[PDB]
């Protein structure tokens with residue numbers, strides 16, 4: 012199935028934050044309405060916060076996360092969780108190799124803000 | 126129900142990262158085996174990272190998140206999500222007031238690392 | 240925080256299914272637009288499906304699950320999860336006693352149907 | 354990524370319940386430790402329960418769900434959610450065609466029981 | 468499959 016694609020409420024500020032757990036340098040691209048809105052990169056095996064940014068979901072609400080390592084797309088897993096019918100997390104894991112720990116880049120999207 | 130308490134695999138390193146969305150200064154305490162192992166403090170209405178650390182879940186694996194504002198504990202909501210049977214998120218939201226957005230401090234715990 | 244309350248897309252059919260795991264008789268009430276739309280009752284310690292129904296979320300989309308045992312309200316826990324940005328589960332557990340297994344009545348709401 | 358595979362606590366009773374939302378007859382196989390433990394079959398476009406059963410996770414705790422329609426494997430999506438650190442849901446959706454609603458067979462695994 | 472197929476479902 013498609014992974015890493017989320018429909019947010021339109022015109023809504025959200026946080027996006029990326030963590031790295033790999034010997035490979037991660038590149039995380041965050042697209043809003045199919046256009047790149049943020050890019051994060053780093054290399055850590057100890058959960059470095061390689062980027063964090065506040066974005067706006069825009070008129071479409073479409074947010075997509077993509078991860079690559081040296082130009083090779085990683086395999087993605089994702090889900091969205093809502094707590095007490097108000098607090099939203101969109102979650103992404105990614106695998107750049109063969110051990111299938113799916114933490115090589117981890118991306119957390121959260122809203123509402125403020 | 127009890128919230129903000131998670132059983133991790135024993136003696137496992139995990140990341141913990143806290144975000145703030147409130148006019149009040151957030152204090153986030155992370156307990157491992159019922160003893161404080163990390164404390165973050167900060168104030169933001171724009172989802173600023175107020176702390177991030179790597180901890181060891183220890184012999185019991187018991188991890189607890191507590192949030193307080195101006196000396197008063199916030200009300201917590203939490204859940205754990207597992208993706209592709211490998212990637213774990215323990216998620217906490219908190220409410221310090223009356224508007225029930227439950228984002229006043231947001232805490233993300235993730236494992237495995239590395 | 241409030242639990243067992245979910246905002247579905249308006250006017251949308253959804254499934255609701257209740258399981259029992261307790262020595263006490265469970266009463267599960269499902270409210271749409273603040274009015275009971277389905278009720279299930281039964282006693283099981285073996286996960287009996289005490290009821291399943293298809294309901295319409297109505298003009299507000301507001302769905303609430305309540306659980307009681309001989310009139311005494313159970314404590315609820317809940318969350319919503321979305322898979323591949325299309326498949327929704329609203330999940331409820333409940334506790335009628337002191338052992339905190341929170342499975343005494345379990346309620347699963349799923350949409351879309353068809 | 355692999356979907357529909359879950360590590361349960363060993364030697365633990367769990368419920369498995371399958372719903373159908375498709376014009377195609379759904380075949381749901383539940384494997385425990387790589388051996389078929391239950392098979393459900395049925396057809397509904399109205400979320401009918403096509404099977405429910407209590408199984409034991411055995412010495413390995415490995416549980417796998419597979420869905421096919423007349424010999425065509427369905428694409429799976431899945432996640433596990435834990436509420437108040439006690440109540441577990443393993444959730445599966447599946448898609449037998451190209452409309453990407455992933456509800457064609459829906460499978461819910463829940464534990465603990467009793 | 469192919470929707471309702473005008474009164475003969477899935478095959």
Ligand SMILES: *C(=O)C[C@@H]1O[C@@H](C)[C@@H](O)[C@@H](O)[C@@H]1O
Pocket residue numbers: 353374375376377398448449450451452453454455457468469470471
């Ligand atoms: C065949 O018609 C496709 C199929 O059945 C439909 C009624 C609908 O449930 C669709 O999601 C499913 O894949």
Ligand SMILES: *Cc1cccc(C*)c1
Pocket residue numbers: 468469476477478
């Ligand atoms: C959905 C479908 C499959 C095979 C044959 C027919 C006529 C229809």
Ligand SMILES: [Ca+2]
Pocket residue numbers: 106107108109110111112113114115
């Ligand atoms: Ca890896």
Ligand SMILES: [Ca+2]
Pocket residue numbers: 032033112113114115238239
């Ligand atoms: Ca890794």
Ligand SMILES: [Ca+2]
Pocket residue numbers: 220221222223224225226227228229
């Ligand atoms: Ca608040």
Ligand SMILES: [Ca+2]
Pocket residue numbers: 124125146147226227228229
């Ligand atoms: Ca707030």
Ligand SMILES: [Ca+2]
Pocket residue numbers: 261334335336337338339340341342343
């Ligand atoms: Ca109980």
Ligand SMILES: [Ca+2]
Pocket residue numbers: 260261340341342343466467
């Ligand atoms: Ca029970």
Ligand SMILES: [Ca+2]
Pocket residue numbers: 375448449450451452453454455456457
């Ligand atoms: Ca389908």
Ligand SMILES: [Ca+2]
Pocket residue numbers: 352353374375454455456457
């Ligand atoms: Ca369908």
